[PDB]
Amino acid sequence: LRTTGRAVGEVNSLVVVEAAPYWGRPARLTARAAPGRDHLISIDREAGL
Amino acid sequence: YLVGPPSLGKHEALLAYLSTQSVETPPDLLYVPLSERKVAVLTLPSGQE
Amino acid sequence: APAGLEVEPFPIQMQVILVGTPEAFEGLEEDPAFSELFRIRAEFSPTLP
Numbered sequence A: 001l002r003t004t005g006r007a008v009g010e011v012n013s014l015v016v017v018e019a020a021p022y023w024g025r026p027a028r029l030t031a032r033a034a035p036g037r038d039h040l041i042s043i044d045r046e047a048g049l
Numbered sequence B: 001y002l003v004g005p006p007s008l009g010k011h012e013a014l015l016a017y018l019s020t021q022s023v024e025t026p027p028d029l030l031y032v033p034l035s036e037r038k039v040a041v042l043t044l045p046s047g048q049e
Numbered sequence C: 001a002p003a004g005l006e007v008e009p010f011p012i013q014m015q016v017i018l019v020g021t022p023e024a025f026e027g028l029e030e031d032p033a034f035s036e037l038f039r040i041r042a043e044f045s046p047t048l049p
Helices: B010-019 C022-029 C032-037
Strands: A010-017 A023-030 B028-033 B039-044
Touching: C022 C032
Parallel strands: none
Antiparallel strands: A010 A023, B028 B039
16 A cells, blocks of 8 residues: 555555454555446446356 | 333432332232132231231 | 252453464454453564564
């Protein structure tokens, strides 16, 4: 995880972990803006069916 | 009925407040067999048991 | 048994030192009743300085 410099579309988002002892911590979040479908896909929730 | 988040000491404080109240001579409770199979709940003045 | 033996409560004095994997206590830490009893986590890491 980088706490210095710049990057495009990349953010060190904060979240509290409950799959671990209760604590806040950052994780790298990546956004891909790709010309194509008008639909927005979030794979971290969507898994099909 | 008392509602509140846990670890609030509801039982302890409730008991502490209840212990300060006064009720005049709660009658002694007893069972009286009206037959071989029938039992009736009876109340009596204290000391009449 | 025609009639069991009734054990009245007593003020406990023991120190319960549970042992388990971090995942083992993850199934118990979810309820708030575990926290109001236990405040002491003896934490072991798989790494040392």
